[PDB]
Amino acid sequence: HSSLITPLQAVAQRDPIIAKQLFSSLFSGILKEMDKFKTLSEKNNITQKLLQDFNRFLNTTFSFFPPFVSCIQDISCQHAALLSLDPAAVSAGCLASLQQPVGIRLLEEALLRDVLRWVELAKLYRSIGEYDVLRGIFTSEIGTKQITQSALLAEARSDYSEAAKQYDEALNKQDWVDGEPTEAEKDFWELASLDCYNHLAEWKSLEYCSTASIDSENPPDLNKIWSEPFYQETYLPYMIRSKLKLLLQGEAD
């Protein structure tokens, strides 16, 4: 009546998956067991300390380990407290640890019952293909500007000339007095401009439009691409790719 509990821990340290699923069951079991006594003014602060530790884990980890990442993101999505865990670090964790489709489900359960979650969900679904939910979220919650649908229709069918030539018009809207958008599509217009620049053989405007929006009239391209960690993710690879394809024709430059 005890000779099963000890081989559980004996097989635990052998391979990580069984122990990961064991811990993810056991913590949820004890956390369900604390619901009986320990009344309402305890669970709130206990869960706040818990999510503080989970945010601490996901921020401070440096050696990317996929079963550990999936373990913490699995035990997050199973109670009524940990849903608003971290709409920022979860995407970096699942992208650098190649474990997208558990953090994706955590973000969807977060969006059940709130803009940057959609933004980093777009950066999530950009990793695994899935372009027909990528377009599907850039018309629902990021929008209310009537250039978005007009460029997305010329982008849904591959016609990436008009899909570029109604974005540089949209970027420099001077007054446009009907209300002004948030930054959540100010970046999206530039990013989709980069993408439709890249889908055609057009890098000369692409490098100038990428490297223009970070610095002054002449590029240092020296530390600001390395500082401000948005710039290592978004502006970096299209810039280096465009410079590469532009040099590979044959120049000196």
Quickly list DSSP for 39-73: -HHHHHHHHHHHHHHHHHHHHH--S--HHHHHHHH
Chain-centroid distance, C-alpha 87: 8
Q: Give the Å distances, CA to CA, from 172 to 175, 176, 206.
A: 9, 10, 17
In eight-state DSSP terms, residue 80 is S
And the tokens for 77? 């999505």
Query: After which residues does the chain become discontinuous at a C–N distance over 2.5 Å?
Result: 113
Secondary structure E strands in 129-186: none
Distance (Å, whole) CA 124 – CA 118 = 9
In eight-state DSSP terms, residue 143 is -
Is residue 225 within 8 A of residue 235, CB to CB? The reply is: yes
Q: Which amino acid is at 85?
A: L
Distance (Å, whole) CA 196 – CA 208 = 14
In eight-state DSSP terms, residue 139 is T
Distance (Å, whole) CA 122 – CA 133 = 8
Q: Give the Å distances, CA to CA, from 15 to 12, 62, 69, 139.
A: 7, 21, 16, 44
* Exp. method: cryo-EM
User: Backbone dihedral region of 181: left (phi > 0), alpha (psi from -120 to 50 degrees) or beta?
Assistant: beta
Chain-centroid distance, C-alpha 7: 40
Q: Give the Å distances, CA to CA, from 96 to 58, 73, 93, 120, 250.
A: 11, 14, 5, 14, 35
Angstrom resolution of this structure? 4.3
Q: Say which residue the tokens 């929006």 belong to.
A: 213
Per-residue burial over 68-77, b = 16 or more CB atoms within 10 Å of its CB, e = otherwise: bbbbbbbbbb
**Contact residues for 61 (Cβ-Cβ < 8 A; gap 6+):** 68, 93
Distance (Å, whole) CA 239 – CA 241 = 5
